[PDB]
Amino acid sequence: APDEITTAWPVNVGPLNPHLYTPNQMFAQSMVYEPLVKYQADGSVIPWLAKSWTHSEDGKTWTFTLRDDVKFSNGEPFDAEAAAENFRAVLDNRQRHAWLELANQIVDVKALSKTELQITLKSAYYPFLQELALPRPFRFIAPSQFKNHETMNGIKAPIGTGPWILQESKLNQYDVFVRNENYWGEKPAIKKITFNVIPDPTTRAVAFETGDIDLLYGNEGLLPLDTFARFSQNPAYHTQLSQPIETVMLALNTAKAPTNELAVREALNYAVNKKSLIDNALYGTQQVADTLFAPSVPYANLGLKPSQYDPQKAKALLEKAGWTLPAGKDIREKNGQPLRIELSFIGTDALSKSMAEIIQADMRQIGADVSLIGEEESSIYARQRDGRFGMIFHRTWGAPYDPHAFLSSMRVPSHADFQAQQGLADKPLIDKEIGEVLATHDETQRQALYRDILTRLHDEAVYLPISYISMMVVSKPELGNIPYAPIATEIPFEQIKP
């Protein structure tokens, strides 16, 4: 049918518990569940399930006036009691939301009436509203669908207030969504969306070619980039490539030899020809990055100095630090130790592998021996949490997480960023400033704090920025132009209009 589309995803959508993480897929959570306030491209929020709000002070106390016409898809009312119950369900699982600072900040949530919801905070936390706009955890399921008055141990039916309803879900096969005919807002033009489960990139491309699917929408791993370029020239298809949404980079372990040495980290930051990496591995479809956050990111236009590809300077830095070439060898040594660094990545990911081979080659030219460790997903995530790496592939989180939520999470010990930064003498100071910047109201101090944090991270060469990557689209021409959502992980199916 013509108001029915078929697309694909590498895995199923999950149970669609609005308050939990893996294996729930964010974009699908955002299809079913809705926030109090909705994020926009300009960086503000607009009213959503909450039609208005006031704050005290000195903002520790916020009072939201909720809409009074909203129903969950099962007929039950959305009201302040329903909302307060959801905040309780999430904060009963507080430990698991450590990465998100609002979760440590909420002191209390209570329904003052049916339409009045009061939320009090530990301090005047500036990104309050943006964090409420996230896909998860602060979105609302029907409280009748809690299991014994909680969500952290599972839910019953995934009943949201959103424009889409999960119809059917078959493990390792497909997920089917259907339009909410009783939605409080704008009715979407599409009536039915089918997600076929296709874990392999080339298989996804083939499925589009044979006509089995109408739409692919994702990041740089969506399909092979050479196939994408070919598709963009094929008059029978439609393709798109957005403006960059986030950064892809290596994180270097400042706590582990030999990346513990500033001079070594600086040298590595001159070793990679990033344009060539991009033209070679990413088929020219992405942009070079010479900084943890692109100059376009809020608070991140700082005139930071790039380290341009310069093997001559890389070698000089290494020689000066005492990493010199022994007789007939190509690998530097210092104290008898070789300049050896492990680069760990997901071994099944062909793009990572490609990029890692290029990185390994470039670094060999300046006399560093990069050893490639490709392992399964769990092993890699286990490495990121324990600091068991020399270098790893990492990325930022895009809007609305960048830069505040990304820096926030640098303070959490079981994250890759904390671990990479562990060896820095000024790490306690940086973590303290991250805490300050999030609670500050003085705009000039806020800017000064971001500058100091990002500058120290740049100068200490914690990262090796690689590119700023884009969203991509392949579609049947009949679907028309495919819009992008403000939040990088969401897919605006509601806005597709054949």
Q: DSSP label at 264?
A: H
Q: Is there binding between residue 98 and ligand BHR (CB under 6 A)?
A: no
- Rounded Cα distance between 389 and 324, Å, is 24
- Rounded Cα distance between 94 and 84, Å, is 15
Query: Quick one: angle between helices 350-365 and 262-271, nearest 10?
Result: 110
Name the residue nearer to ligand BHR (CB basis): 20 or 454. Answer: 20
Residue 453 CA, chain-centre distance (Å), reads 20
Name the residue nearer to ligand BHR (CB basis): 51 or 415. Answer: 415
Q: Is there binding between residue 22 and ligand BHR (CB under 6 A)?
A: yes
Name the residue nearer to ligand BHR (CB basis): 19 or 238. Answer: 19
CA nearest neighbour of 370 among 361, 379, 378: 361
Find out whether 256 and 386 touch, Cβ atoms under 8 Å: no
Q: Shortest distance, CB of residue 21 to ligand BHR, whole angstroms?
A: 4
Whole-number CA gyration radius for the chain: 24
From residue 219, how far is each of 145, 216, 240, 395, 491 by CA, in Å? 33, 10, 11, 12, 11
Mark the segment that binds ligand BHR (CB under 6 A) among 18-26, 116-124, 346-354, 470-478. 18-26
Helix (H) or strand (E) holding 339: none
CB atoms within 10 A of CB 203: 14
The count of residues interacting with ligand BHR (CB under 6 A) is: 10
3-state helix, strand, coil in the chain (%, to 5): 30, 25, 45
Strands of 354-441 (E only): list them: 369-375, 391-395
Interface positions, 23-42, toward ligand BHR (CB under 6 A): 26
Name the residue nearer to ligand BHR (CB basis): 21 or 283. Answer: 21
Q: Shortest distance, CB of residue 105 to ligand BHR, whole angstroms?
A: 16
- Rounded Cα distance between 85 and 63, Å, is 16
Q: Shortest distance, CB of residue 297 to ligand BHR, whole angstroms?
A: 14
Q: Shortest distance, CB of residue 22 to ligand BHR, whole angstroms?
A: 4
Q: Shortest distance, CB of residue 36 to ligand BHR, whole angstroms?
A: 17
Q: Is residue 301 helix, strand or coil?
A: coil
Q: Shortest distance, CB of residue 25 to ligand BHR, whole angstroms?
A: 9
Q: Is there binding between residue 126 and ligand BHR (CB under 6 A)?
A: no
Q: Is there binding between residue 17 and ligand BHR (CB under 6 A)?
A: no
Instruction: Indicate the burial class of 312 (C-beta count within 10 angstroms; 0-12, 13-18, 19 or more).
Output: exposed
Q: List the Cα angle 225/229/231 in 5-degree steps.
A: 110
Name the residue nearer to ligand BHR (CB basis): 155 or 318. Answer: 155
Q: Shortest distance, CB of residue 111 to ligand BHR, whole angstroms?
A: 26
Q: Shortest distance, CB of residue 30 to ligand BHR, whole angstroms?
A: 10
Q: Shortest distance, CB of residue 273 to ligand BHR, whole angstroms?
A: 28
Name the residue nearer to ligand BHR (CB basis): 416 or 454. Answer: 416
The binder of ligand BHR chosen from 59, 65, 99, 369 (CB under 6 A): 99
Q: Shortest distance, CB of residue 160 to ligand BHR, whole angstroms?
A: 16
Q: Is there binding between residue 393 and ligand BHR (CB under 6 A)?
A: no
Q: DSSP label at 71?
A: B
Mark the segment that binds ligand BHR (CB under 6 A) among 37-45, 190-198, 294-302, 396-404. 396-404
Mark the segment that binds ligand BHR (CB under 6 A) among 21-29, 66-74, 353-361, 422-430. 21-29
Find out whether 231 and 473 touch, Cβ atoms under 8 Å: no
The binder of ligand BHR chosen from 397, 426, 479, 495 (CB under 6 A): 397
Q: Shortest distance, CB of residue 54 to ligand BHR, whole angstroms?
A: 28
Q: Is there binding between residue 401 and ligand BHR (CB under 6 A)?
A: yes
Q: Is there binding between residue 21 and ligand BHR (CB under 6 A)?
A: yes
End-to-end CA distance of the chain: 12
Name the residue nearer to ligand BHR (CB basis): 22 or 444. Answer: 22
Tell me the sheet residues that pair with 247.
468
Tell me the sheet residues that pair with 333.
324, 338
Name the residue nearer to ligand BHR (CB basis): 18 or 258. Answer: 18
Site mask for ligand BHR (CB under 6 A), range 53-92, x = bound: ----------------------------------------
Mark the segment that binds ligand BHR (CB under 6 A) among 3-11, 31-39, 268-276, 397-405. 397-405
The binder of ligand BHR chosen from 392, 489, 491, 496 (CB under 6 A): 489
Q: Is there binding between residue 136 and ligand BHR (CB under 6 A)?
A: yes
What phi and psi values does residue 80 have, to the nearest 5 degrees?
Answer: -65, -30
CA nearest neighbour of 465 among 410, 397, 393, 408: 393
Q: List the Cα angle 434/438/444 in 5-degree steps.
A: 95
- Rounded Cα distance between 147 and 154, Å, is 6
Q: Which residue in this structure is represented by tokens 């990679």?
A: 272
- Rounded Cα distance between 46 and 39, Å, is 7
Q: Shortest distance, CB of residue 229 to ligand BHR, whole angstroms?
A: 25
Name the residue nearer to ligand BHR (CB basis): 21 or 53. Answer: 21
From residue 58, how far is each of 39, 43, 379 by CA, in Å? 23, 22, 46
Interface positions, 249-288, toward ligand BHR (CB under 6 A): none
Q: Is there binding between residue 378 and ligand BHR (CB under 6 A)?
A: no
Q: DSSP label at 247?
A: E
Under the rule (CB under 6 A), what is the footprint of ligand BHR?
A: 21-22, 26, 99, 136, 397-398, 401, 415, 489
